[PDB]
């Protein structure tokens, strides 16, 4: 064309605006990790469903006050008691056991002294209550934690272990959630060999497919490996159609600059009839990053055609692809987390906004983490990149950023 230089902000907003939210499905709660609820979840039981002891000790009548009491029996966990505590009496309780009728408080064993037990030692007979219990003391009334009819999880909730536990608690074992996107990845280039291949003259190994697939899998999404496609329109079109058939998202790398054998934009526009929203981004690296949508049968397929350069591919995957996938799986605010960090080294600014993988480290008591760019100590190289340095365009004023200065870092890995 060549396509107009799209600002990073416009590119990003465009990606998020044009990316659809996937439909819903019912899953088992155990499979809920990373999923977004598409329904409100309601409790059908009280928690606790019975008045429950907070302590190991004795269920008592507060009105009896302190004194020596006969132990008429035991309320054990999982058993509904049958006896009624009368004045002068108490019942042994364990944590979480039901409070028997007639008792209105629990006194913990520490606030008691044992008077009499069986010759065996099996059974407590008589106990001294040393304190004045307040009514309701150390008891969880019915519904104290969760009431029947209460909404315990709202739609839009991004679920982790505790939410799964809550679902378990209220017995809601099937829930409606957004689907996860199925993401197909292909590499392009006549020069590319499989990782498993010995080198041949003029060839190199395909690395982008592995890196991109791993990046997507790290976020929990199912993937499809479309292999290596040669630099020619027919094969590219066929591969793209396959991806379209098998997946919600297609990621390609390579062939998006203006070289003689860079065919992706051509194929996307002319042959696939997709709508290219941008074909160049004013960013370093990632200049030729291309974003397209294809509407078939009321379904929007999304296509990221990333640059062939490996660094560019992984960086742009992290900047554009992951947020899109996050929106598709129903996350309401799909933006990545951005944090403030101190630069470990000086850095020259480019007229384009710059992006670089880094490692975030927190030092013993210093409030801000340090961001160390990868590529350039022993222990540091044994850590995977967990940040993406986001450096601003140079200006007539500011030309270079110095060690210790605060910059924005996008989180791309567990810290």
153 token code pair: 């999880």
- Looking at 17, 78, 118, 119, which residue binds a copy of itself (CB under 8 A)? 78
User: Residue 76 Cβ, how far from Mn ion at the closest point, in Å?
Assistant: 10
Which of a copy of itself, Mn ion, ligand ADP, none does residue 196 bind to, with CB < 5 to 8 Å depending on kind?
Answer: a copy of itself
Candidates 89, 309, 105, 317; CA nearest to 207 is: 309
Contact indicator for 92, 124 with CB cutoff of 8 Å: yes
Among 10, 128, 144, 203, binds a copy of itself (CB under 8 A): 203
Does 259 bind Mn ion (CB under 5 A)? Our answer is yes
Q: Which of residues 102-141 bind a copy of itself (CB under 8 A)?
A: 109
96 binds ligand ADP (CB under 6 A): yes
Within 52-111, the residues that bind Mn ion by CB under 5 A are 95
Residue 32 touches ligand ADP, criterion: CB under 6 A: no
DSSP letters of 211-236?
A: HHHHHHHHTT--EEEEEEE-SSHHHH
Residue 67 region by backbone torsions, left for phi larger than 0, else alpha for psi between -120 and 50, else beta: left
Other residues' Cβ atoms within 10 Å of the Cβ of residue 162: 8
Out of 211, 257, 275, 293, the only residue in the binding site for Mn ion (CB under 5 A) is 257
Does residue 1 interact with a copy of itself by CB under 8 A?
Answer: no
Indicate the SS3 state at residue 102.
Answer: coil
CA dist 162 and 179 (Å) reads 21
**Interface of this chain with a copy of itself, residues 38 to 57, rule: CB under 8 A:** 45, 47-50, 56
Residue 166's binding partner, choosing from a copy of itself, ligand ADP, Mn ion, none, with beta-carbon cut-off 5 to 8 A by kind? a copy of itself
Cα separation, 246 vs 249, whole angstroms: 9
Q: What residues does 185 pair with on adjacent strands?
A: 225, 251
How far is C-alpha 9 from the chain's CA centre? 24
Binding mask 56-95 for ligand ADP (x = CB under 6 A): ---------------------x-----------------x
DSSP string, 21-47: PP-EEEEEGGG-TT-BBSS-EE-SS-B
Positions in the binding site for ligand ADP (CB under 6 A): 77, 95-96, 187, 189, 191-192, 204, 206-209, 253-257, 259, 262, 288, 307-310
Positions in the binding site for Mn ion (CB under 5 A): 95, 189, 254-255, 257, 259, 262, 308
């Amino acid at each position: 064309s060549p396509f107009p230089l799209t600002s990073m902000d416009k590119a990003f907003i465009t990606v998020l605006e044009m990316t659809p939210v996937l439909g819903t499905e019912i899953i088992n709660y155990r499979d809920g990790m990373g999923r977004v609820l598409a329904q409100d979840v309601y409790a059908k039981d009280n928690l606790p469903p019975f008045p429950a002891s907070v302590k190991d000790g004795y269920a008592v009548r507060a009105a009896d006050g302190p004194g020596d009491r006969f132990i008429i029996g035991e309320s054990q966990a999982g058993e509904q008691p049958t006896q009624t505590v009368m004045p002068g009496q108490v019942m042994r309780v364990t944590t979480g056991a039901p409070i028997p009728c007639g008792a209105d408080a629990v006194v913990q064993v520490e606030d008691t002294e044992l008077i009499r037990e069986s010759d065996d030692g099996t059974e407590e007979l008589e106990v001294r209550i040393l304190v004045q219990a307040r009514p309701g003391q150390d008891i969880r009334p019915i519904g104290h934690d969760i009431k029947r009819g209460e909404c315990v999880l709202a739609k839009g909730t991004h679920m982790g272990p505790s939410e799964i536990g809550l679902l378990a608690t209220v017995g809601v074992t099937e829930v409606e959630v957004n689907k996860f996107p199925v993401v197909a990845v292909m590499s392009t280039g006549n020069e590319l060999l499989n990782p498993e291949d010995d080198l041949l003259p003029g060839k190199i190994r395909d690395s982008n497919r592995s890196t991109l697939l791993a990046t997507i899998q790290e976020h929990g999404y199912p993937t499809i490996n479309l292999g290596i496609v040669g630099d020619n329109p027919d094969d590219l079109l066929n591969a793209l159609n396959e991806g379209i058939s098998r997946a919600d998202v297609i990621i390609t790398s390579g062939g998006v600059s203006m070289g003689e054998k860079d065919y992706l934009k051509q194929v996307l526009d002319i042959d696939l009839h997709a709508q290219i929203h941008f074909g160049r981004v004013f960013m370093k690296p990632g200049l030729p990053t291309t974003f397209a949508t294809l509407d078939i049968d009321g379904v929007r397929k999304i296509i990221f055609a990333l640059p062939g350069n490996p660094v560019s591919a992984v960086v742009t995957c992290n900047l554009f692809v992951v947020p899109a996938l996050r929106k598709m799986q129903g996350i309401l605010d799909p933006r990545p987390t951005i944090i403030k960090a101190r630069l470990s080294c000086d850095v020259k600014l480019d007229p384009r906004p710059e992006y670089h993988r880094c490692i975030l480290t927190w030092h013993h008591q210093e409030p801000l983490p340090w961001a160390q760019s990868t590529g350039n100590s022993r222990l540091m190289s044994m850590r995977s990149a967990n940040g993406l340095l986001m450096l601003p365009p140079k200006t007539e004023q500011y030309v270079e950023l110095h060690k210790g200065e605060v910059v924005d870092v996008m989180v791309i890995g567990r810290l």
